[PDB]
Design a protein around this ligand. Structure first.
Ligand code: ZN
Ligand code: ZN
Lengths: 213, 212
């Protein structure tokens, strides 16, 4: 089967910027390549067919080029509606195969997160488990390190993170990190802390609490 | 207007089969190939097969090892994809798509969840404001299947609200938090209630979140 490999996997750009996404096929696929745009919750939308032909109605700022193994999608001047994930596909040979996608996100100025920590609620504790939640609010860029410490000891393997899509108002991200323990384990320790490292912070910021106030 | 309309979300146990429909309209059904493609994190977009309704010939991606059957009813301009011997890795959004130098037209997608888990409504726990902006929220925990809906103050409160994507826990149940940032000065006067609905379990919960 033919592997379609896109480069880069993600990029940050501003409105008006020229954007270039490349796709390398593992073997020749002629010009039987299509490009798509996909937004969250929606099916992909066809942009380019037969490597270089805009599909009916697609704006002239989108163009495709290439043949054989090397393909390029260009957006000559990025518009607000163009922030999305883009995919290549070959239909030269079976099975048809797709690239992994390239996410085009909005560039903005660095913004440090506000950090908040939430102990487990008395309600949850009644029920045998303890979740501790660390919130990072409205930061940019997406890259952030969130480290849990319990009685000053670094944790591993007992937290999960979730991140929002870029905010439609300010183009920032928000992120939750949730530490889950048994109530029995939770009650064995005093200090719960999340430490956040981000480009916008001059040094890491720690939010912590003492169990049971 | 070419339209492809698929059947609704499905939840299946491993070993079961799922059959998804794709109702085609606005064109001559017998003259285009209709394909099936799926999407899930980690494998990405994956082509499954096609049917040509003119003669009901079908061809499949060999990777599915005969688990996929695509059929078409010419009398109703409807195509069907059946996927048998389901595994958790078959959890994905399934699309039908009409072919012509690529895929110009797609159905809306059908979510199929494959899990050993049983339907369960969420526990809803407050994330109390404690420590001029305060953060508060609700932890919506241990439900199956997706989705849940969360609102604040019956939808009156939308500014500063972040409802995080669900994460699948090792238990096979989902969890998420919804948070909102508000003026610290509102905490004594303004009531904050998260409204959580989980339709598969008939769960509708309103949890008042108060300072601790
Ligand atoms: Zn300890
Ligand atoms: Zn926020």
């Amino acid at each position: 089967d033919i592997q379609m490999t896109q480069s880069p996997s993600s990029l940050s750009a501003s409105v008006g910027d020229r954007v270039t996404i490349t796709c390398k096929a593992s073997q020749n696929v002629g010009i039987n390549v299509a490009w798509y745009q996909q937004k969250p919750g929606k099916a992909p939308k066809l942009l380019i067919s037969s490597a270089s032909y805009r599909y009916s109605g697609v704006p002239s700022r989108f163009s495709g080029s290439g043949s054989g193994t090397d393909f390029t999608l260009t957006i000559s001047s990025l518009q607000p509606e163009d922030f999305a994930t883009y995919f290549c596909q070959q239909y030269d040979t079976y099975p048809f195969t797709f690239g992994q996608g390239t996410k085009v996100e909005i560039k903005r100025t660095v913004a440090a997160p506000s950090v908040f920590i939430f102990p487990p609620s008395d309600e949850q504790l009644k029920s045998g488990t303890a979740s501790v939640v660390c919130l990072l609010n409205n930061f940019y860029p997406r890259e952030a390190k969130v480290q849990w410490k319990v009685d000053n000891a670094l944790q591993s393997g007992n937290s999960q993170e979730s991140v929002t899509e870029q905010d439609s108002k300010d183009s920032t991200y928000s992120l939750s990190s949730t530490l889950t323990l048994s109530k029995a384990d939770y009650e064995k320790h005093k200090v719960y802390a999340c430490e956040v490292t981000h480009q916008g912070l001059s040094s890491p910021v720690t939010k912590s609490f003492n169990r049971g106030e | 207007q070419v339209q492809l309309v698929q059947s609704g979300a499905e939840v299946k146990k491993p070993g079961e089969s799922v059959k998804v429909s794709c109702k085609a309209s606005g064109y001559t059904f017998t003259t285009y190939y209709l394909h099936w493609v799926r999407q899930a994190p980690g494998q990405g977009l994956e082509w499954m097969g096609w049917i040509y309704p003119g003669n009901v010939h079908a061809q499949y991606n060999e990777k599915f090892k005969g688990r996929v059957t695509i059929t078409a009813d010419k009398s109703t301009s409807t195509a069907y994809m059946e996927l048998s011997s389901l595994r958790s890795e078959d959890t994905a959004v399934y699309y039908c798509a009409r072919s012509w130098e690529g895929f110009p037209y797609w159905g809306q997608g059908t979510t199929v969840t494959v899990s050993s888990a049983s339907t369960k409504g969420p526990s809803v726990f407050p994330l109390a404001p404690s420590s001029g902006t305060a953060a508060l929220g609700c932890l919506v925990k241990d439900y199956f299947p997706e989705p849940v809906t969360v609102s604040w103050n019956s939808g009156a409160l939308t500014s500063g609200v972040h409802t995080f994507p669900a994460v699948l826990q090792s238990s096979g149940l989902y969890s998420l938090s919804s948070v909102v940032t508000v003026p610290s000065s509102s905490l004594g006067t303004q009531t904050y209630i998260c409204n959580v609905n989980h339709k598969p379990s008939n769960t509708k919960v309103d949890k008042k979140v108060e300072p601790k």
